[PDB]
């Protein structure tokens, strides 16, 4: 089924003239090095987008409504207003607090929020990333608080001991009073593997009403949107249906850089790796200049047997493509075993270098994920063959305008 | 015509074909080198521009090098400013450092207390929003809160706050309470950074933490990045070194880790360009079998015939790294000066570049080194061969 341009060309590559076997190894791994680091590079960026949908978007609410300092006398009617808006799935109130978790000779800034435990699971998955099973019996009377993982190693605390935090003293008169250090016990620890581990804490809503000495009053209304990309138009529609112009914001001004700077890598290393194959395509140019010189007598047989100039041009185009297909396909088969098994690879280098890469104190996550997609594998195979076609077209043009009369035919 | 026999055997081997394509395939090892050095200078200059932007904002303020004593408190009468003759510093000023908490009329917060002198100059002085540096009077216990610090606390101009030192405290037997003190604001400062979220400027003459002396000297470093070499130097007795690694140690380590990751990402172009010389010189020996074997018949040692192919693999690395550093220093300098169609950022507000003179030299000598190790193996096959076992 193969034509004359393909099926009668692999016998010409079987040439032995000394150290030519070393040229077939360097030119193979020279073009397979750029493909093997491009498959594991784009699959690693797909892993950072996979971990962003569940460990960032599913734990942080999109709606963020800071109203006037009058503590929400119309919060009951405001919960049903944003619920009937198309685009918003659910809604739940929250009270912003600021405390300092301390156990002795250590101070850590924490952000305490008061959410209802029987209402937070409808719009976001907070207990889906908790190590301990003690996520229930979260009601009034017990006075418990669950903290993250970043404050667990810094405070050197466990699940069960009593800690001392700070609460804001509520007073309508502008003066200074004594601080209150309420003694609460830790009822579990959660793990998000990121920045929300040392500055995140949640308390039940029934326990936050007695701290400010109020009744039924909240200090913020949170919600959840279905379309996470439209964080500009949908937020302005919910702010006017409830009250006047207040301090209304969204997650696009805070976590907008986490979704960013991964598509910049999709443009930076793409242009940086086609230059690697572009230098690797120069080995294909060097091996086709020689291929015309040593087989110059074989071209003189075709010029006497009735072959046009288009047939001789198509011989050396597919001759360099067969040498490029053996190197490009050898980089794909060594990229699947690294992308699918990256977790025993990255952890092996960290055991002999001491400091582990991608520390979760300032980065996105701690480990290095990898999500191999079959769409990105097809994008490199067209890219690796288009660079090999432009590099093999110019030696194929020189092999057709040669004079068969000046050579011995 | 040249008297040197080593260079006369390879000068006519550069350009031999009369066609323009025959000389284009001979200089392919040069184009692969100068496109990797240009990709290593222009990209890393953008990362150095983001690093210098984080140096004038995070390491401009929040002073790095303090000289704490063995017991913490340093007496200025025993250790004067004329005794600390360490290298790298340029100005010695009294300063104190201690983590405190905040207690306003609305909520609580945390911050870092910084006691500056009202007579000495400070980089926070031009960033003061209608605040005078001479307003810090001893005995009045004033405070200069930040912009983001007073915003979350609800503190305006003319509010009384309460600070408290949790580390250094007098352990009274009537309940273990820390030492607290009421502070009055005089104004806020704005710096458009993360410094004004926790920094507070108080007077240097205060006994809120302990005692009357200071904790250390404020050392302005000329290069605050290489503090590892400035900490293991000849240190005087009764003093300790405390750099910026206690607070922002993991922040600037991530910037240096991303520089080595992108630096290793762009160094693969030079490795394939070093592989191009092995393929180019690997085929030249197989076709010049009558030229190498006729040189040994004219009374030539095999040590000199190895240098004929050694310079041919080195001439592409010498002129490739010079042209790569020349074109790499013109694209990064004229990136945003000529025309902004090179790719607009999300803000586009004065995107900086940084061309380090010591970074260009260390990059180009590596490109002249990898091309040299990829030349000895094709040169060994052309020098250790046998003239009797040649083609004729």
């Amino acid at each position: 089924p193969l034509s004359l341009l393909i099926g009668l060309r692999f016998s010409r590559g079987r040439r032995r003239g000394g150290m030519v076997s070393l040229i077939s190894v360097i030119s193979t791994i020279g073009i397979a090095l750029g493909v093997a680091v491009l498959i594991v590079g784009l699959s690693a960026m797909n892993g950072f987008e996979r971990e962003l949908n569940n460990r960032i978007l599913a734990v942080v609410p999109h709606g963020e409504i800071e109203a006037v300092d009058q503590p929400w006398t119309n919060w009951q009617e405001a919960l049903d207003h944003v619920q009937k808006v198309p685009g918003i799935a659910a809604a739940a109130p929250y009270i912003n607090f600021t405390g300092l978790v301390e156990s002795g000779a250590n101070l850590r800034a924490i952000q305490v929020k008061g959410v209802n435990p029987q209402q937070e699971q409808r719009l976001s998955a907070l207990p889906s990333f908790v190590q301990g099973d003690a996520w229930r019996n979260f009601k009034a009377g017990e006075q418990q608080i669950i903290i993250g993982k970043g404050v667990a190693d810094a405070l050197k605390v466990k699940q069960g001991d009593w800690v001392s935090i700070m609460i804001p003293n509520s007073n309508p008169e502008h003066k200074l009073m004594q601080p209150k250090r309420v003694r609460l016990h830790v009822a579990g620890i959660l793990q998000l593997s990121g920045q929300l581990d040392h500055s995140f804490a949640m308390i039940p809503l029934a326990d936050a009403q007695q701290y400010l000495d109020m009744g039924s009053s909240v200090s913020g209304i949170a919600l959840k949107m279905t379309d996470v990309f439209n964080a500009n138009k949908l937020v302005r529609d919910a702010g006017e249906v409830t009250n006047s112009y207040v301090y209304i914001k969204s997650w696009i001004g805070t976590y907008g850089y986490m979704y960013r700077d991964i598509q910049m890598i999709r443009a930076i290393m793409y242009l940086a790796m086609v230059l690697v194959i572009g230098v690797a395509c120069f080995n294909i140019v060097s091996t086709l200049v020689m291929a015309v010189k040593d087989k110059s007598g074989d071209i003189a047989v075709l010029r006497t047997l009735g072959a046009k100039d288009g047939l001789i041009r198509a011989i050396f185009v597919w001759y360099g493509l067969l040498a490029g297909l053996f190197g490009s396909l050898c980089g794909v088969i060594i990229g699947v075993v690294v992308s699918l098994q990256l977790t025993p690879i990255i952890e092996w280098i960290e055991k002999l270098i001491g400091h582990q890469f991608l520390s979760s104190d300032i980065y996105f996550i701690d480990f290095l994920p990898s999500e191999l997609h079959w769409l990105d594998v097809f994008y490199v195979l067209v890219t690796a063959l288009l660079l090999s076609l432009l590099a093999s077209w110019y030696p194929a043009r020189r092999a057709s305008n040669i004079d068969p009369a000046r050579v011995l035919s | 015509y040249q008297p040197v026999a080593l260079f006369i055997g390879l000068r006519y081997m550069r350009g031999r074909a009369a066609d323009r394509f025959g000389r284009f395939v001979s200089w392919l090892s040069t184009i692969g080198i100068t496109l990797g050095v240009m990709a290593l200078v222009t990209v890393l200059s953008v990362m150095n521009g983001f690093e210098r932007e984080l140096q004038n904002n995070i390491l401009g303020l929040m002073p790095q090098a303090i000289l704490s004593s063995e017991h913490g408190s340093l007496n200025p009468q025993q250790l004067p400013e004329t005794a600390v003759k360490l290298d790298g510093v340029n100005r010695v000023a009294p300063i104190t450092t201690g983590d405190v908490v905040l207690q306003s009329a609305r909520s609580v917060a945390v911050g870092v207390m910084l006691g500056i002198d009202p007579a000495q100059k400070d980089p926070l002085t031009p960033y003061l929003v209608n605040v005078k540096q001479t307003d810090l009077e001893p005995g009045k216990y004033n405070v200069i809160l930040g912009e983001q610090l007073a915003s979350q606390l609800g503190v305006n101009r003319g509010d009384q706050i309460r600070v408290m030192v949790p580390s250094a405290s007098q352990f009274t037997p009537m309940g273990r309470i820390p030492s607290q003190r009421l502070f009055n604001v005089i104004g806020t400062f704005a710096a458009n950074s993360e410094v004004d979220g926790y920094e507070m400027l108080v007077n240097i003459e205060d006994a809120s933490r302990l005692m009357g002396n200071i904790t250390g000297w404020r050392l302005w470093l000329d290069e605050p990045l290489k503090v590892d070499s400035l900490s293991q130097q000849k240190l005087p007795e009764g003093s300790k070194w405390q750099d910026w690694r206690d607070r922002k140690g993991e922040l600037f380590q991530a910037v240096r880790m991303e520089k080595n990751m992108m630096g290793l990402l762009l160094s693969l172009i030079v490795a394939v360009a070093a592989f191009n010389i092995i393929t180019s010189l690997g085929l030249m020996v197989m076709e010049k079998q009558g030229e190498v074997a006729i040189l040994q018949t004219q009374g030539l040692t095999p040590r000199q015939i190895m240098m004929v192919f050694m310079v041919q693999g080195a001439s592409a690395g010498i002129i490739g790294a010079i042209l790569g550093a020349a074109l790499g220093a013109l694209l990064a300098s004229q990136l945003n000066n000529l025309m902004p169609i090179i790719g607009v950022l999300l803000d586009g507000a004065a995107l900086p570049v940084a061309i380090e003179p010591l970074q260009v030299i260390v990059i180009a000598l590596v490109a002249m080194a990898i091309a040299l190790l990829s030349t000895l193996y094709p040169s060994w096959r052309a020098a250790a061969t046998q003239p009797a076992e040649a083609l004729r």
Binding site: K249, G253, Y257, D261 | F50
Partner: peptide, 10 residues
């Protein structure tokens, strides 16, 4: 990454 921006909007 290394590009930090703390420009908030109320």
């Amino acid at each position: 990454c290394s590009s930090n921006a703390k420009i908030d909007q109320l």
